[PDB]
């Protein structure tokens, strides 16, 4: 029916109208001063005025810095842009690790493109092309369930009539914008012309020859990128199997981007298109090599760079790249000037017990009070993780005993069968040979 | 013209090769088409005039 | 189908477990571990609801005791129709492929889409087929007649047809299924006359079958990448699928769930000896076992306070600790003499190999005494050794003379000890000679 | 001797007889017709083929429409005459692009000069023997006829010879015939082979067809031998 | 348009008078008198042309404005001259040479001028008619083409007949044909035919038909840079590597026949050599190989003025065991005039902020700038510079228009400098992860 993974319980930031958070809304338990600074940012993204501002939050592991990623993300809606990113996929063996956080940092930035859709199809009734060798147009008779409809045609769409292999008593699909023809098959007042035949027979089209649709296309100026910067060529439209050569990324000159920025800028004047900022967010930075954190530092001073957001759980960590360079969360000095730290607190008891109760709602468990101080207790002695997966294994063990609610028993025989990370540290330190 | 079944007036799908009979399916076939006397196929097929 | 001559964990066909998920003493071909089987239960549970998704399950324990007997336990009674996905650690330093990007492949390759659909089809016996053509042969008329074990008909064909006849050719006496959509012809064989074989086929002519579709997630991102079609399915070079034709196949994943037409099956990933990943990868693990469309991942490993690779410190298990907060770790114990009796007999029984009982229970002292794998290994030899004799049963001196030919670890090392001035030591110094 | 045939045909369980080619692979990848529909066919509920406009015609970068400057500037670069190549260049494929190659006249008021090393090989193309810079620019074919390499024998046989891998798709006929288009393209299949001289008599003499509205042929390279172009060996 | 607020966009320009004297607050930059007189030197240099193979250094602390400098000689360049900017981390590819990337970054800021001139005649085709001779060798056409005001008759030769059949127009579709070098173009149709055809299908484009004088005289000027030319001549179609990158290690010989040739230009008088500019921003992550190749690629004619910034100390370099001043071996350091910025004070904090707040358009308050000022003082001035941003957005939420102290409290309390997430990890160490993967998960022990 429904799924959940480890999230799916945040909904937002649950703020009001004034920026003050509520102590439970949304998801949150507790974390008032960093879901402000969560406001506060998501606030500045959707004033759609900056470039290049930056964000790092810090703090303990399993404090919920991917939580408060996520409420940023379901705050600003689906509409803007948000890229998910973990530090470790910047390593590429095709291209360098500068031009995929280029490619990121370029996939932060939307459109909104105000487009039509107009659909002729339905039964062929007439194919009479006409010529002043060369073809001059052609005057195709459409036919549905609503009323017959008739056509003049270019014959450039009749060069792709004939590449369908089109004739009377088919029924076609015509795209007038794009020019697209797409043959669906025989009619089923046709299907006795024998009485075994190759073709498919489909009925006729139960509404009207034309219809019309508005809609809305978004894209990213990554995509604009990388449609024109194909280094074999362009595709067809139908490719079931693809080229014989195998076309690689290749790093993408500035010029390109210049151009497409000009094509963007003359379009968007005009009223065609909406231009959104969005959010490459990346988690684990201090995975990060010395060398993409300095093109971050250049690539931060650009004029259509997106708001960077990034998560560490270090302390005085050696940035990696280097032998000797310590300093905070796993980023350079350099960076963290430009930089703005928003820390992450731990939590007491009340509020672990307090997203036990929450997780376990979302979970569709029923457990006693007993129980859930257990688990709380649990939580506080060895981790908020171990008392949070241990919850579907206790309802796995409750519904053995068919039973729809947790008892302190089945706690008790997940914590016997499942064990933490010091207890498997403890076995490990007593063992012989290899645990 | 649309292919139908002489005995029942469904939808025809198989011709009987001995005797030339439009049949929907395995029940008409068995029971009908296959033990009938001669005679009878000159007076069904005179229904659509086919003899 | 799916040959296979004998393997290690052959004679295992599933968790031995009753319907209130209690482990049976010897069922199925697994002995021992009790603890360790009602986890691995609680997690093919886990699976079979389908409710959650994510969670990260470490197995641990000393070497040769059953890890990779439990993991191919579970793959076997979770069955078919799920998707499986059993890796190594060192399956992901590709040189065309990245690492995050191998494991995204093999993340996505574990959840697969049902999806039923019919298909009308036609198969009967062909009796007699006649072809009329002209001199030019524009015009071509014929006639077939077809039949099952229940009903006849003749059917008259049109051009297209005559051509896809005369194509991959259909004589009188064959068993044919048709397609009539898309023109497929397939040639099921002969029937049963004397005057390969198969039967008639019975029931109607125009069978309208449905069938059970199972598509994996890569194989979606594969086709909808526009830049190379579905033989990088097989070739092995999908190089580097982008991140936005990932986010169509999880929208359109989406919206086809909620218009119910597809459903989500989700299944297991495997990685067996997990402790030779590098730390970029454990990275990109922790982000990538909190999506929605993640499956159940178990991991094994069996070194004990090791140097993690790519850092310069120790970690429990090879994995640093914030891995470690997101997995729940089932551990393993040694084997008594009872239970490795109980393994040596079932794959006594299992490779056809019969035995005297004093053999039994010295190849049981010697497998308490040096290992398990030593004495399931010398099991296979001493049949030989049997059969160079023309006897059927082993007795205690074959298990004897093959003790004495094949060697084992710590008798090794102490000969290496004993003759080290033969050898090349780790400084490169060897003694050739034997005199002076 | 021949390699494995990893194929399966119409066999026959023994006024012309005609044989038509039928060899299939016996792999079969399954798929189904909802993913074919929904995602590569567009249809209403999609929006295929107008992100494929607004990808390569509205936004492309060598539109003359919207880049002309950009088109001019390429033009004084490469001095090609017309403006809309390079729309023709970066939306067709490869292939394409090579087997119609035609050698048109470039202007000379224009920055692509003639390179020392093409000026060498455009020497000696139609330069007969005994001229030195023919005999300095033909190294590989005197390698060929002294070591006697047109009258070798052939050693090496490939083991498993096996067609494309079939994909079927139940209850469709667009797939049959897209996949008929893509595994027997009459353009490259006719690049791949030559047209009969009779046949091509009939064309230019009586049809009126000159021989420039030909579609090109011939594009297949030599083998080394008679022996080198097959794999059956008597 | 499409540029946000960038980083350093009040910059426009180098603030200098005629005798390349700094104004103390003008053209966006504050203060930095000495190094704005030696960047308006080098500005100077550029302009006069003559000098090539010079190599300078902007060396200082950071938030100093090395790269605000950059920008400012980037802005007061002018156009048609080109000024690359790269990072040091660009040049570590996997498919293309250290040397070779410098090489590329080398001729990608030097360019030639070509300057030439333009007959168009741009207009709607009305009717085509082609006359065939007897003999077939020679052939005619009739062409009426039209604009809003005039039409007329043009006659033409076989060669457009063979390049008009190709890219077929049918009566109506917007041309425009060259007459000294023929060039000859499909602009679309035009918008009088739009309800003709009924679905207009994939290959066309509707466009205004063009109104005025249908015969223009146009001169535009091209200025094209010398890795375009190899990037051209390498190949048979060179501008696919133009716009997707893969040019592949360009050898030496097309090289140095471009380099004659544009000297046989120059000294005929079709073209002029425009030099460049090229900024190197942080130049201290390259190996002793690339510094190398710059001390040797230095010393060429047709090389142009580098401007390198770094700002580390006494620090090693790569790809050595040593340490050596910024980063730089003493080799590369002898062949450069190194520019020292210093740190700011005060006022020339508070002037920056102001401006900075004025461009991003935000309104403050005397006491809220005073407080941003000192605590520009006391922390980096980007902090404050940032803080500006988050506090405008702070003071919106109060449904307040102006900048008050209260919301920089806020943000100062709510957001976090380094030197406070220094202290603060400090006194919680078994909270975090160290250098040896050592962390205290549970808050109970
Ligand atoms: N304030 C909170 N309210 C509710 N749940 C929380 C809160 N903070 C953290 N969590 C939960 O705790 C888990 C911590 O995981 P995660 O955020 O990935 O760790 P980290 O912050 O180290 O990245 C999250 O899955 C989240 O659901
Ligand atoms: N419970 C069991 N039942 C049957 N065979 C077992 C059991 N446990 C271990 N074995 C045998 O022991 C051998 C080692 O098991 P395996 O799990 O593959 O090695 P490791 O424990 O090093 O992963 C296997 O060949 C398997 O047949
Ligand atoms: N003289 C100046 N006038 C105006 N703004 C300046 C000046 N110097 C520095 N800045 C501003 O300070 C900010 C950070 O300085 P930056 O140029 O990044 O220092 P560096 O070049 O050492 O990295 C820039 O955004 C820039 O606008």
Redesign the pocket.
Known sequence: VTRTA??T??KGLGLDESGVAKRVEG?????IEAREACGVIVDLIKAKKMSGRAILLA??????????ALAISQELGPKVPFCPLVGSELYSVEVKKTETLMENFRRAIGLRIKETKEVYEGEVTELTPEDAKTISHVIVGLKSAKGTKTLRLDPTIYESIQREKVSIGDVIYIEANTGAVKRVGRSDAYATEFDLETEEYVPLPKGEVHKKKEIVQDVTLHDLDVANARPQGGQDVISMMGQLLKPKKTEITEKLRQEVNKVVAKYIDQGVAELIPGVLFI?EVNMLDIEIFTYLNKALESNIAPVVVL?S?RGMTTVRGTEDVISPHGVPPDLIDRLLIVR?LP?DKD?IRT?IE??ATVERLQVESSALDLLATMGTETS??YA?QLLAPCGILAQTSNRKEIVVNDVNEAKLLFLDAKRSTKILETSANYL | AKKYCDVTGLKGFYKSPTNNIRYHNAEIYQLIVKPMAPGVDQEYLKLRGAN | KSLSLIAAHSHITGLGLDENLQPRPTSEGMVGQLQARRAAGVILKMVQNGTIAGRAVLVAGPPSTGKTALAMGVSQSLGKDVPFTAIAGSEIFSLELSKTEALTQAFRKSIGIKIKEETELIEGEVVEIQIDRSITGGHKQGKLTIKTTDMETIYELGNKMIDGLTKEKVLAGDVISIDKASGKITKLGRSFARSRFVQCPEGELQKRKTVVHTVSLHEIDVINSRTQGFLALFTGDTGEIRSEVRDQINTKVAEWKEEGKAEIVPGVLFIDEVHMLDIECFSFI?RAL?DEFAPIVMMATNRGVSKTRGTNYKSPHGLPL?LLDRSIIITTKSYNEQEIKTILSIRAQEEEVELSSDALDLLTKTGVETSLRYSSNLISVAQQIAMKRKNNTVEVEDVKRAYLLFLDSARSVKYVQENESQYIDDQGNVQISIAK | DSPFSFTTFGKTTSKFTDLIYSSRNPIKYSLPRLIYEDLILPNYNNDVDIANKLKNVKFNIFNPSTNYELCLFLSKLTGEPSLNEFFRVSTTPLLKRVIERTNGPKNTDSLSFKTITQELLEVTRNAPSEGVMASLLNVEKHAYEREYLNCIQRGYHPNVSAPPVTIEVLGSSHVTNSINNELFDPLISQALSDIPAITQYNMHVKKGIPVEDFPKTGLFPEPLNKNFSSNISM
Do not use: M, W
Request: net charge neutral; proline share 3%.
């Open positions: 480890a999230h319980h945040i998801g949150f338990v507790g974390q703090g303990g592991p399993s404090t919920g810095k991917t939580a408060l988690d998560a759980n992450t939590y509020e997203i929450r997780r908020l993780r949070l | 922790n909190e914030d």
